[PDB]
């Protein structure tokens, strides 16, 4: 089980922490309407940060083992980034088909 | 790249019982919902269901609650909505549309993801009786500058009927209006033409009603009387 | 659930919705299924233009179209959730607005044909005028009719951009041999045309 928070309206260049909280494997995806469910961030908990080209270094994703938490700071916002976000090669590490569990997500709006 | 392809419905007796099917394509089936929104000729939209994965998340609106059911199969990539029970208010165009797997939980004040990829719509009409329309001449009102001619479509049930004139070789200023109710629980309309008056006499005006509930087709000759 | 019904505009034109959860707006345009344009209050989906915008002016949400366009003449639907329900609002035409135009006004008796199965159906017609707002009124030997007649306006026409409206008076067989004159009058502002027929010339 997964659940996120965090989630809410922003302004374009504003910023926003999305949390999670867990009950073996991290990663972050979002889903706007029209488009599939696209990865954003990943973390290799054994080590490690890898991100899309969609999060030109705007996005960070930290840990805390000892509150069993992964989160996402996401910096600079912009419209294109309004979703919904949810909760192995390291080729193939940013792809929905690799992931056991998911949260039911929070949704974020970016508008001005 | 992403297809919803409905199918299913059309005429049904009231008392009757039906099955339409959106079978989708090109995305992962069970990170979303699937909604049935309905239109009834020449009146709002009405959503109606929705299913996602998990059975249990269901819902319906008060209008069909009893009456219909949804349902879904993840082998292929389909979902159902059984309808029975089928009144009058039923008639309408059906569309399937796609929303987000976990709509309800995420809605909230600033966020509403709404049903991005639709169907193309099915039909459903439930004749609960028929009749075939009387057709009567709206004759020439002048003999000159403009005259008008028309047809009145009468006491038929139910929708609709189609009007063409000249078999479609005249369509210019041509007005078929939208049936009416009429208190006898009959519908009517009128179908009317406007032409050169100085054509009465060398060109024929027919009207070709079309009535496929009833599978009639009256064709009228209007002439000056 | 209520927005501003009915709307004329030009190309060129701002135009703005209202709609009384944050709301989603769907256009659609006659015999063609919805299309999904803001979601989420104010987020423009793919593929949309630029010109439209969302808001929420208060406590209401809002649609813009800041230069309205020839392919933007449609129906616009807010829709909102509650609980596990979702519903559409009443819908808002955005047509046309053009030049004033009187109706031509044509009286039609009943035929002979309807006659002799003991109807009698008087239609009056309202062709090519613009705008649709009239008000129409039966008269029978002078006196004015209600209760007896039923009204119908087509969509706008898609070469002049005007209205046409018929209006039909039912009365018995009987009711009509009674009786003399007939006449409908057709008002648009300052404006009142009557036509009218002597029954049986």
């Known amino acids: 089980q997964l659940v996120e928070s965090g989630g809410g309206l922003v302004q374009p260049g504003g910023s926003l922490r999305l949390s999670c909280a867990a009950s073996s494997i991290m990663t972050w995806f979002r889903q706007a309407p029209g488009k599939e469910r696209e990865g954003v961030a990943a973390l290799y908990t054994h080590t490690n940060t890898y991100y899309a080209d969609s999060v030109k270094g705007r996005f960070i994703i930290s840990r805390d083992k000892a509150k069993n938490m992964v989160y996402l700071q996401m910096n600079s916002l912009e419209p294109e980034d309004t979703a919904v976000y949810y909760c192995?090669?390291?080729?193939?590490?940013?792809?929905?088909?690799?992931?056991?569990?998911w949260g039911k997500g929070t949704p974020v709006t970016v508008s001005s | 790249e992403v297809q919803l392809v409905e199918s299913g419905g059309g005429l049904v007796q009231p008392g009757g019982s039906l099955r339409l099917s959106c079978a989708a394509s090109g995305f992962n089936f069970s990170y979303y919902s699937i909604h049935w929104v309905r239109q009834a000729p020449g009146k709002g939209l009405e959503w109606v269901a929705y299913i996602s994965s998990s059975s249990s998340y269901t819902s319906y609106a008060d209008s069909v609650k009893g009456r219909f059911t949804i349902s879904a199969d993840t082998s292929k990539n389909t979902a159902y909505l059984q309808m029975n029970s089928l009144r009058a208010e039923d008639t309408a165009v059906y569309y399937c549309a796609r929303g987000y797997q976990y709509w309800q939980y995420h809605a909230s004040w600033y966020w509403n993801g709404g049903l991005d990829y639709w169907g193309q719509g099915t039909l459903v009409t439930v004749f609960n009786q028929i009749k075939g329309p009387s057709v009567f001449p709206l004759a020439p009102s002048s003999k000159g500058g403009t005259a008008a001619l028309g047809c009145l479509v009468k006491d038929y049930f139910p929708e609709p009927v189609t009007v063409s004139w000249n078999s479609g070789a005249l369509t210019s200023g041509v007005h078929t209006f939208p049936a009416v109710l009429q208190s006898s629980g009959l519908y009517s309309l009128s179908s009317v033409v406007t032409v050169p008056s100085s054509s009465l006499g060398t060109q024929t005006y027919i009207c070709n009603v079309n009535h496929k509930p009833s599978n009639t087709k009256v064709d009228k000759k209007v002439e000056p009387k | 659930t209520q927005s501003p019904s009915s709307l004329s505009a030009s190309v060129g034109d701002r135009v703005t919705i209202t709609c009384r959860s944050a709301v989603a707006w769907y256009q659609q345009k006659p015999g063609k299924a919805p299309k999904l344009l803001i979601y989420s209050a104010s987020s423009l989906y793919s593929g949309v233009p630029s010109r439209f915008s969302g808001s929420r002016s208060g406590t209401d949400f809002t649609l813009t179209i800041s230069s309205l366009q020839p392919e933007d003449f449609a129906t616009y639907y807010c829709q909102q959730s509650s609980s596990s329900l979702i519903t559409f609002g009443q819908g808002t035409k955005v047509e046309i607005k053009r030049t004033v135009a009187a109706p031509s006004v044509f009286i039609f008796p009943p035929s002979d044909s309807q006659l002799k199965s003991g109807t009698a159906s008087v239609v009056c017609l309202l062709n090519n005028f613009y705008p649709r707002e009239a008000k129409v009124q039966w008269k029978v030997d002078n006196a004015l009719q209600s209760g007896n007649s039923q009204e119908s306006v087509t969509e706008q026409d898609s070469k002049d951009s005007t209205y046409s409206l018929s209006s039909t008076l039912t009365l018995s067989k009987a009711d009509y041999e009674k009786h003399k004159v007939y006449a409908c009058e057709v008002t648009q502002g300052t404006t009142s045309v009557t036509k009218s027929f002597n029954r049986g010339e």
């Open positions: 192995v090669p390291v080729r193939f590490a940013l792809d929905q088909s690799s992931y056991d569990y």
